[PDB]
Amino acid sequence: GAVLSFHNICYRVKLPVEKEILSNINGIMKPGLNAILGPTGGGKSSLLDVLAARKDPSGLSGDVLINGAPRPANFKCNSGYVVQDDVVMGTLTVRENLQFSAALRLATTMTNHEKNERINRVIQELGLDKVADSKVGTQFIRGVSGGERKRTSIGMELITDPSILFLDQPTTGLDSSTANAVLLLLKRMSKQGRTIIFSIHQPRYSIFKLFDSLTLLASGRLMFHGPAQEALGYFESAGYHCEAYNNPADFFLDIINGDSTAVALNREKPLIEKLAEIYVNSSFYKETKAELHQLSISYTTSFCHQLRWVSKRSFKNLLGNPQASIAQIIVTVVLGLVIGAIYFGLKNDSTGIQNRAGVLFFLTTNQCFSSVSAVELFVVEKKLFIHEYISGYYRVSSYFLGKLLSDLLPMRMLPSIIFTCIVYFMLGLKPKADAFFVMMFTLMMVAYSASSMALAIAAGQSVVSVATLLMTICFVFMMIFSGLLVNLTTIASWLSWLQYFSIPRYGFTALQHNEFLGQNFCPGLNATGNNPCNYATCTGEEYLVKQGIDLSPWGLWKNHVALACMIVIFLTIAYLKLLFLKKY
Amino acid sequence: GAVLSFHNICYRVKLPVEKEILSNINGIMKPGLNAILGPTGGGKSSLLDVLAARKDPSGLSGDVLINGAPRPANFKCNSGYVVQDDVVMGTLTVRENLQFSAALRLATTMTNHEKNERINRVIQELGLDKVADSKVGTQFIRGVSGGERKRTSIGMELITDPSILFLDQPTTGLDSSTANAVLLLLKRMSKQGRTIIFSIHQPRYSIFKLFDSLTLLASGRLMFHGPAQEALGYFESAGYHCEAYNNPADFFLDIINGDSTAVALNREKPLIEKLAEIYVNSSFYKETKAELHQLSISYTTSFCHQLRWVSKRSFKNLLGNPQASIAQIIVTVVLGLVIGAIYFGLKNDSTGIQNRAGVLFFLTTNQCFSSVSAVELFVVEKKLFIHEYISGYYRVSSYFLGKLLSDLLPMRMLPSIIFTCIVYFMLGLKPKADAFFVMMFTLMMVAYSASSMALAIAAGQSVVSVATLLMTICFVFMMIFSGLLVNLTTIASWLSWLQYFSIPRYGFTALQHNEFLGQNFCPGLNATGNNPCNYATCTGEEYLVKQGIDLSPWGLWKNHVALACMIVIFLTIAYLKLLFLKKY
Numbered sequence A, B: 001g002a003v004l005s006f007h008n009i010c011y012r013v014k015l016p017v018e019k020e021i022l023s024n025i026n027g028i029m030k031p032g033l034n035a036i037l038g039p040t041g042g043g044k045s046s047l048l049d050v051l052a053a054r055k056d057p058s059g060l061s062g063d064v065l066i067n068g069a070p071r072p073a074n075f076k077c078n079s080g081y082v083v084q085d086d087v088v089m090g091t092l093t094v095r096e097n098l099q100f101s102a103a104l105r106l107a108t109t110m111t112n113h114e115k116n117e118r119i120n121r122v123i124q125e126l127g128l129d130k131v132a133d134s135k136v137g138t139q140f141i142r143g144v145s146g147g148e149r150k151r152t153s154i155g156m157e158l159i160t161d162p163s164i165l166f167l168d169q170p171t172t173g174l175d176s177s178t179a180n181a182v183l184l185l186l187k188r189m190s191k192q193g194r195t196i197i198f199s200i201h202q203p204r205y206s207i208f209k210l211f212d213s214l215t216l217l218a219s220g221r222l223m224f225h226g227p228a229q230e231a232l233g234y235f236e237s238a239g240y241h242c243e244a245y246n247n248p249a250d251f252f253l254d255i256i257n258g259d260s261t262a263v264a265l266n267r268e269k270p271l272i273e274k275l276a277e278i279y280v281n282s283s284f285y286k287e288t289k290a291e292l293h294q295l296s297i298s299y300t301t302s303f304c305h306q307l308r309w310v311s312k313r314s315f316k317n318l319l320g321n322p323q324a325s326i327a328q329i330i331v332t333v334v335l336g337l338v339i340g341a342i343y344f345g346l347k348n349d350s351t352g353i354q355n356r357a358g359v360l361f362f363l364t365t366n367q368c369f370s371s372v373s374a375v376e377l378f379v380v381e382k383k384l385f386i387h388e389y390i391s392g393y394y395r396v397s398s399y400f401l402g403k404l405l406s407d408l409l410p411m412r413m414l415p416s417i418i419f420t421c422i423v424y425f426m427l428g429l430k431p432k433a434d435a436f437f438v439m440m441f442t443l444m445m446v447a448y449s450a451s452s453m454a455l456a457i458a459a460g461q462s463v464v465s466v467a468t469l470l471m472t473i474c475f476v477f478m479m480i481f482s483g484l485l486v487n488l489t490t491i492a493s494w495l496s497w498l499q500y501f502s503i504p505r506y507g508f509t510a511l512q513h514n515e516f517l518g519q520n521f522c523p524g525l526n527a528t529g530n531n532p533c534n535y536a537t538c539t540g541e542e543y544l545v546k547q548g549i550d551l552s553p554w555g556l557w558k559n560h561v562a563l564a565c566m567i568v569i570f571l572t573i574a575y576l577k578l579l580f581l582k583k584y
C-alpha cells in the first residue's frame, strides 16, 4: 500500500496581501479509508489539493511524500482526484464520459470490449443504470441530476483503478442510502490495498464506522488526527462527553464549530486556539511526529491513442451541435454566389483587371475574417482541458493536435473547397486545371494561417473578449498592407517592412500571380494602339510588375512558404500558451 | 400564511421520445417547514421547479394553487427560490452580491443604510463574516469555498423576505453544525408565517425534528406525504419497524431505496409500485385529496432603479477586469498612428483622392470590424441573466439598457473619439471645426450600428461561435457593396438593392461627403489644363458625382438617419431575442 505523508504543511493565498489558509498541519495516511471532517471554510479542499499536488507551490511550505519518497512524475497517471464541482462534459453521455476516461487512463493492453465490461460494472455499482445512456446536462439544457452527475465524476476516476484516491466530498448531493452504498464500495476497494483520502460533510453513523483514520480541520488548523475509533475517547479527556449525540461525527463538529457565529445566533482563549493546543500536547501528535521523522511523465496510453480519442470526442460534439458548421457552409455558398454574380462574366477589357484584382481581394478578405471564429476553439473548453490535463488523461500535444482537426477539417478545409468551386464555374477565371487547385490551395493557406493566429491570441484564455478584438483589428491592420488600396512601393521604408506580416498580402499576391500570368487585356484594338488613356495595361505581366510581384514560378510559391511559416510559428505560440498555462 | 397546493401534477421531458419524470403527485404545503426527502433521481428538483413555476408548461399536467387561487404575475417578486447549483456572480463579493439583490428585490422605501443593516444581519446569521468582503470565485480563480458560496445563494434569497421560500437542497455542502444552524434559522423564519418548502439530503435527527410536513419522492412517485411526526408511525403499519436506526430520515430512505442496484451490490411487485400503492389507499392520501377539492408583472423597484444598478454592477466588472477595454484603446491608438503615418501629408494632387478615399475606407472598416467584440455582451452572462430574471430582479428592458451602457460608452463611444482625434492632427483632412465633429459622429454611428447588429445576432445565445462567424462574413458581404472596389452604379438592378443594407456604405459615403465637399485637386496647373489624363478629376464635387453621392446637405445626413434606423431595428431585434428567450 501507499503511505502518503504530509509534514509541516502550510499554505498562503495572495488576495498583494497574503492570507494563511492551512497553518501547520502534519499527518500520515496509511492504506485504508482516511476521512477529513470539519466546518465549511476549514481548509478541507485546500488540504486535499496540497496532498493531490494541485496547488501552486509558491505558497506551499511543506513536503508531501509517498512511502517516504517524494512524488513521482507519473503521479496523475497513478492517482485519482474526484473534485468537488463535477467537471463533466455535458454534451456526452454518462456512459460516454466513462468510455472516454477508461480509454485514455487505462492501458491499451486491455481490450476495448473488456474496458466496456468494467464500465458496466461501475455503472451498476454506482447505481447509474437508468441514466447510463442519458446525457449529462449543461447549464442551459438540463439533463442528468446533481447527484447522478456527482456519481459520474466518482466513476470516471474509479474505472482507472488508482492506488491513491482523493475525493472532494464524494457524498454531498447523495442521499443517506446512496451515500452509504458509495462508501461501502470504497471500503471494499480500500481493503485491496488502496489509500483513499476524502473529505466528508454530515456522515451518518454507519458511514463513520467505516473510517480507518480521522482528520479534523478547523480554521486551517488541525483539531485532531489519528484513528477514528480512538477519536471519541480523545475528546472525553478534553472535557467533552459524548452521548447527547448518538452519532460521533455530529458530536465532533459541534465542538470545533461552537465558535461559529451562525451557531451562536441560532438556538443559542478562542475555541480554535484552545482545541488546537490540546492536540499538539496530546499523545496522538507525539505518535505522528515521531513517525514522520522515520519516514523523512510517461502517460498510460501513447500519443496516437490520445490523439485518436481527443479528436473522436471533438467530432461527436460537432455532429451533435452542428450549428456553427452548418452556418459556416450556408453563408459561404451565398457569399460565393453573390461574389460570382457581381463579377459575372469577367471580360478582357480596359476595366477587366480592377474587376479581377477586386474579386481576388474579397476572396482573400473572406478567408481571413472567417477565421476569427477559431478563437473559441480552446476557450469554451478551458475548464475541461485544465481538469483533464492535471488528471493525467492526455499530453498537451495530444489535445492540441486532436482539437486542431475539429477546427482544421470542418471549418477551414471544407469551406475553402466549396468557396473555390462556386466562384470558378460562374466567374470565368484562369480556366486551366492546375490554376484551379493553386487557387484552392491558396485559399486554404490563408484560412489556416489566419486561424493559427486566432489560436495564438486565444489559447489559454477564459473569455473571447480580448482575443476577438485583437483578431479583427489586426486584420484591418493587415489589410492596409495587402497592396490594393495604397501602393506598397510608395510606402516609406520605415513602414514598408510591416507588409511582410500581412496574411492577406501573401494570399492576394499568390491569387494575382495565379490569375493574371498569361492573360492579355488589350485585344479589341484599332489601327491605332488601344485607345484608353492610362495609356493601356495590356498584358497581365505588366500589371504584375506594377504591383511589384515577381514573374518567376518562385514568385507564386514565395507566398505559400511564408504562409506555411506563419502556420508553424502561430501554432507553436498557441501550443506553448496551453503548455505553460498555470493550471493549478 | 400561504397554503401552496399542488394537484394531479405530472411532468414529461422530451429527450422526440418522452420520459415521465414526476407521475401523479398531490399535496398541500401549509405555512411551516415542509421537507421533501428521497433518493437521487427521485424528482425532487423537478417537483420544486413545478411548484415555483420554473418548468415549461407544455410538459406539465396539473395545477398548482396558492391559497386556492392560481398564482399571480408578481410571484417571482413575492417568492424566493434558492437553486441547487449556486448561480452567483464571481467577480463580485459576498457582501456585494448581497447588496445587489437587496437593492433590486427590496422596495426603495427602505433606506440604503437600512438595507445594509439587514445585509449585516444575514451575514452574521449565516456565518459569512470572514468571507463577507472576500470574492466569490469563478471557475478559474478560486475564491470563496463551496459551502460559503452555498450560503451566499441562501442569503441572497433571504434578505428579500419572501413569503413562500423554495430551497433546492440548502445544506448540501454544509457541515452538520452549520446545516443545523441554517435550518434553525429557517424554523425561526417559518414561525412568522412563511411557507418554506425544501428538498434535503442526509438530515440529522435534530434537523428532522424541525419539519412540519414530510414528502417522500422516489422515481417520480409519492411514497408518503403528510406530517413528519406521523411519518414513522405510517411505516410501522406497512411492515417496517424503526429502531435499527436512531434517525428516522435514515430509516425512511432505506425503505424507498432498497430497490436501488447500488444498495443491492454493496454490503447486500417492484418496491416502488408496492410502496406507492400503499400510500394511495392509506388515510394520509384520503385526507389530502378531500382537502384539495375544498381548495379547488409589477416589479418591486422601478425601471430606473433597476437600470442604475444593472449598469452600476456592469461598470464594476469593467473596472475590475479591464482587459478588453485597455486592449481596445491600445490597438486603436497604434492603428490610428499607422493610418496617419501612411497617408501623412495628404496633398491636393491627381493622386490625392485615392489617398483620401482610401483612408476614409479604413476608418469605416475599423469601426465595423471592431464591433464583432460586442457579440459576447449577452452571451457570457446568459446563465446569470436567466437566473436573475426568473427570480424577479429586473425587467428585460432594465437589463438590456443597463448592459448597453457598459458596451456603448467604454468600447464604442470613447474609442471613436480618440481614433478621430489621432488621424485628424496628423493627416490633414478637412480643417474646419464642424467637419471634425461630423467625422467623429459618423465614426460613432457606424460603431453603434455594427455593435447593435452584433447584439441582434448574439442575444439569447450560449456560444459566440455561430454569432462571430455570421458577424464577420456579413461584414465582408457589406464591404463588397461599400462603393469603393466595385462601382455601385454598374451593379445590376437585381443586386444593387443590397447596397442599402450595407453599414460601411453609409459610413464611407458620409465620410466622403464630409471630406471632399469644398476641396479642389487640379491646382498646380499649366497654361494647358492639367496634363495628366484619365482626363482629370479636379473638384471634390465631381468626384462625388462620379460615386453617385448627393451634393445637398441632405446627402450627408441621409446616411446618418439610415444608420440610426439600423440602431433602432437591430436593438429591437436584440431586445426581443432576450425577451422571448425560453428561460425555463
Ligand SMILES: Nc1ncnc2c1ncn2[C@@H]1O[C@H](COP(=O)(O)OP(=O)(O)OP(=O)(O)O)[C@@H](O)[C@H]1O
Residues within 6 Å of the ligand: A013, A021, A038, A039, A040, A041, A042, A043, A044, A045, A046, A047, B131, B134, B142, B143, B144, B145, B146, B147, B148, B173, B174
Ligand atoms: N485561493 C483562495 N482565495 C480566496 N480564499 C481562499 C482560497 N483558498 C482558500 N480560501 C479560503 O479558505 C477557506 C477554506 O477553503 P476550502 O476551499 O478548503 O474550504 P472547505 O473546507 O473545502 O469548505 P467547504 O467544505 O465548505 O467546501 C475558505 O473560507 C476560503 O474562503
Ligand SMILES: Nc1ncnc2c1ncn2[C@@H]1O[C@H](COP(=O)(O)OP(=O)(O)OP(=O)(O)O)[C@@H](O)[C@H]1O
Residues within 6 Å of the ligand: A131, A134, A142, A143, A144, A145, A146, A147, A148, A173, A174, B013, B021, B038, B039, B040, B041, B042, B043, B044, B045, B046, B047
Ligand atoms: N430535463 C430533463 N432531461 C433529462 N432528464 C431529466 C430531466 N429532468 C429530470 N430528469 C431525470 O429525472 C430524475 C429526477 O430529476 P431531478 O433533477 O428532480 O432529481 P433529484 O431528485 O433532484 O436528484 P438529486 O437529489 O440527485 O439532485 C433524474 O434522474 C433526471 O435524470
Ligand SMILES: [Mg+2]
Residues within 6 Å of the ligand: A044, A045, A084, A168, A169, B145, B146, B147
Ligand atoms: Mg470544499
Ligand SMILES: [Mg+2]
Residues within 6 Å of the ligand: A145, A146, A147, B044, B045, B084, B168
Ligand atoms: Mg436536485
